[PDB]
From a paper:
[name] is a key protein that interacts with and downregulates the small GTPase RhoA. [name] is a multifunctional protein containing the BNIP-2 and Cdc42GAP Homology ([name]) domain that facilitates protein–protein interactions and lipid binding and the GAP domain that regulates active RhoA population. The BNIP-2 and Cdc42GAP Homology ([name]) domain is present in 175 homologous proteins (such as BNIP-2, [name] and BPGAP1) and regulates various key cellular processes. For [name], the [name] domain also maintains the GAP domain in its inactive form through autoinhibition via the β5 strand, which lies at the interface of this interaction. We recently reported that the structure of the YBCH domain contains two asymmetric monomers in the dimer, in which the monomers intertwine to form the dimeric [name] domain, with the direction of the polypeptide chain changing at [name].
Author numbering:
A (entry chain C), D (entry chain D): 0 to 148
B (entry chain B): -2 to 148
C (entry chain A): -2 to 149
Write the structure that this text describes.
């Protein structure tokens, strides 16, 4: 029975401290489904998550990305998570990706950081060293001569 | 070898401290050309490692990027791409970051738009290194976890 | 001046043809070095101008990015970024885009994620240069247009 | 009055051949509000547009971006368009942005080209020049000697 394989790829692991669902997906386990022939997978996957999250439920998603990357399993899991109906995106408290390779780590942090308004507000674009003196005193910094020419 | 770690310090270093006495780490972008002379090294990985020891896991700090003349490019482009894929704590804990470029608008017009179009969905995500880091956000006692987070 | 136009052709040129005799336009990325010598200029706008003369509107072609080098940069990210902000017809009409680089994944890992997370809404957009170009898609006779698209 | 300064920024300019609305936004016309004070502008705007597109209704949207960049007017009109309830994004058939400055044109084309799956499908990452031979024959190419060291 493959409905069991499909239950070790994605399952309800717990219920956090607010009593809302915490659904786990273990991306590396997308390899069990290679053994089947003439399957869809993403429709099987989509109707299964629909069985684990009904409409109106606020939940948390957690992706265990051990032994997968943006170019293999974690790529498709996340692409597939993005293709979900909007209510799944509206109703998540947070998505967690845990432990992937170095590439994908810095791929993810870049995407998240482009999206972090809290952070992109912190930038301040000045035209020369002179205009910095107002915020950080130039008498407080040892700098090479390159920054002065 | 050691010449490499010294070129790292000419690229990124603590220049001084502000009032409230916190680090002001500068990156003299330009100085990335010092690395063109090298054989095989993942520069960006070694550079992330250097910053990680310049600023420890909780201390508010300031960052400033110098890149005055245009050229091809000022490599300011690549320095902020690197800074954007850095650890999360380095973004939450930074007080302000100053770029000195003049022609900045042409650079960061693309990144301003990608930020505009960033979905509301993708602002919910957070990357974590080990599964222990997921505690504090969700207590792992509430959870059955797959056998791979165990030996 | 003329030296600048020559460094442009050393960077991006027509390389050859395939079948039915469609241009293969090579860009050797390591050749962005030639422009560090210069002062002033918007290199990115000059290169966009140069490609426009190398490939006319509706005409299929193949692109090849040569970046086998290493150190600070292969120049492949900077010239792929430049390629992504080119007019839509250059992307519709390219047959294939061969990027010759060893360590390529570590660069395009970031763009693969941004494409994954790109919304379906964003995919509905299109930039047009002039109000005239909109006629193709929605007929302008059907519409009241604000006086601003006019010059009474 | 002020409700009389919105129809000049957003109107149902007409209908396409398939008999669905087309909504014009003229991003420039957005300083007719610096003269008001108190006015929140963003919520009045959302209310106005909600009165031109009914919930179940497919439409087009065109942005006349004459005299605006990603750093003014056009940037806020798009940040605002992105802030809208999901049905406005599900329901558009297309979004046209017309005639902005060179920066923004390049910024817009870049975002769309990351989005465009048909485009990014066309890349093939070969490891060295030798592998290019199976696709484009090197008999056919004038190349500098650099591509061969």
């Amino acid at each position: 029975e493959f409905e069991h394989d499909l239950e070790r790829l994605c399952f309800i692991g717990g219920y956090d401290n607010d009593n809302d669902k915490v659904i786990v997906v273990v991306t590396k386990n997308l390899e069990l489904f290679k053994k089947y022939d003439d399957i869809n997978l993403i429709k099987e996957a989509y109707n299964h998550v629909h069985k684990l999250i009904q409409k109106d439920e606020r939940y948390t998603a957690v992706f265990f990305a051990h032994d997968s990357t943006v170019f293999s399993y974690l790529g498709l899991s996340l692409k597939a998570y993005y293709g979900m109906d909007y209510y799944l995106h509206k109703n998540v408290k947070a998505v967690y990706v845990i432990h992937t390779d170095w590439m994908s780590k810095v791929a993810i942090r870049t995407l998240l950081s482009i999206a972090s308004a809290k952070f992109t507000r912190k930038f301040r674009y000045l035209n020369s060293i002179s205009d910095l003196n107002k915020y950080i005193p130039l008498s407080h910094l040892k700098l090479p001569p390159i920054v002065y020419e």
